Amino acid sequence: MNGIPVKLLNEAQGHIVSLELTTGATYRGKLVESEDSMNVQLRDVIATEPQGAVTHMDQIFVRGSQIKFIVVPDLLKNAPLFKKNSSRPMPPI
Amino acid sequence: KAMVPPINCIFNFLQQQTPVTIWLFEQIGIRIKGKIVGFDEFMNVVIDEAVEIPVNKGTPLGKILLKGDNITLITSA
Amino acid sequence: RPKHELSRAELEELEEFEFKHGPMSLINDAMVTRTPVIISLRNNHKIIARVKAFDRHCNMVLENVKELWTEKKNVINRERFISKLFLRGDSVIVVLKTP
Amino acid sequence: MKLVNFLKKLRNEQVTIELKNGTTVWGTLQSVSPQMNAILTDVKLTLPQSNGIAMASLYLTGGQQNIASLQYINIRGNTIRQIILPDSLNLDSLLVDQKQLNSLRRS
């Protein structure tokens, strides 16, 4: 259905992440609320245009197809989404 | 006021029959001016009385079924 | 008619009916009469070849490919003969059939 | 009627692949996804006569020492422009389309 990477992107909500866009502009800020379509909203945004300059947005909202990548913090190195043999405690009928 | 979804925005834009400036792709693309008569779910917009002007001597074009994947921006001139 | 509400497992029959009596009349005529067609691609690679198979994505198998492109510096034409080819429908600009 | 199932019958076939960037990849096929994500081994790839982005993509894959010899490359579907099959393979027996034959028998 959804998959592991979109669940990991929805996992790190409310944390300082860093995006890079397809044009080359790198954003960095606190993730407000991520979605399954990766259309992600950031706050306290610092932006670097592909020309080179640095600016600051207050509340950005980027579409998921114009994202090169996004960096989650390192404590999500150890996540239960990464566990291969985690069993399921009795799903409901 | 309220919320106006883009499909109802284009539908009211169709009912009012305002003069239309439709933009397209970048420097190869050419800005078109006309009047909307039909559209669909993939945003294939049908326009009439089309005059094309390049990016900064317009030529008439007639009636055009402009496809969706090149449409960028729609304004009321 | 909406695509999701037609039927189940009978969409292949409608796809074959669109293949026989739709825009696919030229790819069908080339694979049954073995006539050579000229496919112009999105990077000036013009292909003269015969069609072997049809796909929904216009993925086409071509046999006895004679392809030609033009390098513009000055102006030279470089060609290549390739025996078997599997062409993706992403690259295809246009398909012309000769009578 | 997807012809990716035709490429699924092409295991251990020594082919070339021209990509949309312009790189020619000579290697044997191992497997291919139904989304045409094809894996190849015993690979040498070459950017012919330019595109500096393609030269960067050619060199920055490890194993350059402009023919680059690599052991294992997975290739995404949308980067595949065309794939050239060896002429010794018979296309009349690999394109039998047994799924299409079962669909015609089910009609």
Add this chain to the structure above:
Amino acid sequence: VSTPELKKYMDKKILLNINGSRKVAGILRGYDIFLNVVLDDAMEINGNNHQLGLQTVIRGNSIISLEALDAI
């Protein structure tokens, strides 16, 4: 499938960027599940000024991001 969370941008001035430079500053009147953006009183900003009619609708394919120019 999922409706995007543009509820906080209901009556605030936003600034769309189009493809590397076309900064359309408007007031968000509505959106869809395709990020098509309806803007009232649009304004093209160049690094000069250009007005873009009373209402406009902008295709979500060329939309990359949007700056919330007004406080929330």
Add this chain to the structure above:
Amino acid sequence: RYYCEYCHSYLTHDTLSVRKSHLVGKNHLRITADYYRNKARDIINKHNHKRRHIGKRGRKERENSSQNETLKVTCLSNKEKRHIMHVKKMNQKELAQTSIDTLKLLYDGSPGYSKVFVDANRFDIGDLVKASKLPQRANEKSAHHSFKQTSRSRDETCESNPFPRLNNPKKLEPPKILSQWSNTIPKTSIFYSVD
């Protein structure tokens, strides 16, 4: 369907309004915070030692090393090393949690104390403080604390508190010293200090 890997709780068909409300509730917060704390504690506490490589040492190194001296090994009992390592763990966590807060209490009567140090009238991150108040939908969380808020507004000017010594200040804290090395302090002061 949706399954929380943290809380080990299932859900109905995947609604964004339900999944958004699941990551706000207090049980998911407790389980998630405890899981992150325990995984960080495990990756700190895991002493991944190097695999040892012992070679056949040289002859003259053996005649030099076995004749210089023989050192003494110190070692402790089980409860002693357990108590010492527990004190070292609480010292490491209290050093990881602490921070120097001298500039906040040292510029307390400054005329721009209500514009930078108040942390609510701050410009760049003050909207983040004013946004999530944790609005205390429980009545007991609002009825528990009965002390003053002492919220310093931005509009406080220099006319208020003109003389900082008449309004009773606090004497500054002394420089804290290590308790394990507290026996080497000079016991005699330079000047006579009363009270």
Add this chain to the structure above:
Amino acid sequence: PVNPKPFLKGLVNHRVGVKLKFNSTEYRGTLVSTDNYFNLQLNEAEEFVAGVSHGTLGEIFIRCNNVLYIREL
């Protein structure tokens, strides 16, 4: 009032013109058939590079990937 599908089913058997995205390929011919993915099939088409012609083509299949619009003369 109108939709692109009845306008495009009624556009069959007319000297129509199709511009591509590249501003150097315009094909003007008689439309034959069109599917729901809006692939185009033309007959006795003519190539138009930046306005000037090069020669007649004939029966041709224009892919909906590279079209920009279709016009009615």
Add this chain to the structure above:
Amino acid sequence: MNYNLSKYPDDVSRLFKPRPPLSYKRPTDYPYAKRQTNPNITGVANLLSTSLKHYMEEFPEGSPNNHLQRYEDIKLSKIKNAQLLDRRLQNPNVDPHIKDTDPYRTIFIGRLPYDLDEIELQKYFVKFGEIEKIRIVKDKITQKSKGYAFIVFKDPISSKMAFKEIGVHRGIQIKDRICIVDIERG
């Protein structure tokens, strides 16, 4: 970096001190204003004039398609089988075995046993009305019992009641099988 909106406590936030910001350098690709494929692609009319005459001269004949020929042979065999089935099905008044009385009193019992006899079938059919005639149908190529019979009774109401009593209780238990009875459907 100092004060957060985050719902997590400060002990979690000290563990969530993020990475340092990324060291920006100059990009390598063209910007998205310049990202496009190649312009001025010439027409294909030059290949049909000069290159087609050299292409047809090197390969005047094409390769045969064995898979398309096998699919066409399978379609032709299916069409011939359908035509033979239509000729065998299209070609009750020209049958000497169906030259009995009217079908109002003539019921048909199908899926009967292959080793049954006419005496037991007559004794089973004469229980709910007087039977006038009985005829078990067999194949013309072989003398095997196909399991079908036609029983014409003296009255239509008694034959209908016998057919209802034989087809209502999950088929009549004829001695090795369950043979249901119904109308002749002539």
Add this chain to the structure above:
Amino acid sequence: SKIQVAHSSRLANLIDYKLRVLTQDGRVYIGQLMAFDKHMNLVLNECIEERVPKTQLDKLRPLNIKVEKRVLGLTILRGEQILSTVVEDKPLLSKKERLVRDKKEKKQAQKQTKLRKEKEK
């Protein structure tokens, strides 16, 4: 680089390998994969992104090449703007040690299910 990548392996078998994934730009990401999906969205542990400058490209055109390396750490890269992925370096622990670790994870998961069944009673 004498690694001898497996001859019949796929993305489920290439997990926890130090990949060297190529993109459309050529911005090569080096790091361990830990997850994927249908769109080939790859998370990358201890990842580094390397490029070549425009001045170095003239020397690269037909030796030493000074690549520009930035450190990303744990990132999550999309499958749209990527081109190809290879296996650069083998992981730390071996196949038998990963097998023993997977058996310990299975036994720990079965013990956790027994603890949930004991707490449910």
Add this chain to the structure above:
Amino acid sequence: MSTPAAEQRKLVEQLMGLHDPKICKSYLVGECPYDLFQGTKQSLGKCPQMHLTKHKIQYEREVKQGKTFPEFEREYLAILSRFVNECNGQISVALQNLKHTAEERMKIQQVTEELDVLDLISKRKEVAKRVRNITENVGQSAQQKLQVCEVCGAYLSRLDTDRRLADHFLGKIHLGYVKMREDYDRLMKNNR
């Protein structure tokens, strides 16, 4: 749907005289009660009449300048009156259930046993016994401590703070029912 293109096709197919029974008059005027209770626990199922956006836009364009139709307004008034009568019956049933819970048999027996022992010094003893009976009544009422919502007829609480109450008022049921009460009061002010 799993793809958004089929959702947009559905929006086009449902977006593209006028006095016909197929058009939902409560939706043609606005705020149909079968629309304001679609997916909640108080759902009525599915509206048998069809809803359309083009007819709603035509009705808005007619009511802007052209004219107004009193028949659809009277039908919406009758539907709102029937739904308000059903909700008032539900609120009266909830008030009767609250009165039955406040007047249970064992609770009234305990209250009568406390009041039978409730009878200067005698006045102070009677005041202390009345305070003890009031404390027992407060402990009996605090076992549930459920009030009655004056508008929507739900259950509330007095010791609950204003934030959980504000979370209660922002629901689909309460917003829809306050809008229906505003429409009913507007139609009763216009009719009378």
Add this chain to the structure above:
RNA sequence: AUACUUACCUUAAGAUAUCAGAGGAGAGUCCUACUGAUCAAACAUGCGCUUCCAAUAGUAGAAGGACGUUAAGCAUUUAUCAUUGAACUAUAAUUGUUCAUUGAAGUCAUUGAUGCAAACUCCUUGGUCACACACACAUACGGCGCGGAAGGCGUG
């Protein structure tokens, strides 16, 4: 932990490798602890197979780096436009030269950026293993030790 209120929601389907033949069920479909063949997975197992596994008879060195130093190393290149005033080269929205009033944004970086080149130091990895400090080879090298890491082929 029990009891109750409230806010949101209440589900895209079909299937689990392929081919040929025989039998059963009222041209088409299903089943066979039915039979032969291909393929996949798991567990074992062997191929004088393919690659790698760091001195100790010393104070070293192989692979990958430093987001380390010398190093502000050496050689190059840039660090805003317009109106007017006192002269002015002058096809420009006076561009060029010296000085200034004013007008819109106005990356920090010039100890900056690119290229070139050497030395030093420090990090992660290993069989730092068992015998010996030894005279072999045109069919070029007795690959005929105990293993480990990666892979190929073959068998059950």
Add this chain to the structure above:
RNA sequence: UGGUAUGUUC
């Protein structure tokens, strides 16, 4: 035929 979250009393 149910799930998630929250607030009171024992």
